[PDB]
């Protein structure tokens, strides 16, 4: 059988954080109370390029970080920080201009505590694009 339905296109996406408890010697000029080194990221599977449809990713850190709104406008869409605590990060994904799409809003709790060495908290989901316009569909299908 055949039917008409609304067009959708999905793009797999990997996001979250890795982390490590720092040793006795800490990186120079890291605040003395910071205990961990960590990295929050949005990336493609197998580290394939995602900048063909993502223009920039904005990570809102906890207010204890200076300039907590951290805008990453070229790949890799990640940032590395030191710190002492776990907290929620609002991740704002902005698509290329052609998408004509509003921001994609989501949230990730920074994981630092060990498992029940390196820890990670990583999700492997997908972004579904509802009714993409013809030009954006062309861009999405180019990779």
């Amino acid at each position: 059988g055949s039917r008409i339905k609304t067009l959708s296109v999905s793009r797999p996406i990997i996001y979250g954080n890795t982390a490590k408890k720092m040793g006795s010697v800490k990186p120079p000029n890291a605040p003395a109370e910071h205990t961990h080194l960590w990295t929050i990221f949005v990336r493609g599977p197998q580290n394939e390029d995602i900048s063909y449809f993502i223009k920039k990713v904005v990570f809102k850190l906890h207010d204890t970080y200076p300039n907590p709104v951290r805008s990453i406008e070229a790949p890799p869409f990640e940032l590395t920080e030191t710190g002492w605590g776990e907290f929620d990060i609002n991740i704002k994904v902005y698509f290329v201009e052609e998408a004509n799409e509003k921001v994609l809003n989501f949230y990730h709790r920074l994981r630092l505590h060990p498992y029940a060495a390196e820890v990670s908290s990583v999700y492997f989901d997908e972004i579904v694009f509802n009714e993409p316009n013809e030009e954006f569909f062309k861009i999405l299908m180019s990779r």
Binding site: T35, H62, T64, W84, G85, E86, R111
Partner: peptide
């Protein structure tokens, strides 16, 4: 924000 376990 809380220090980890």
């Amino acid at each position: 924000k809380s220090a980890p376990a």
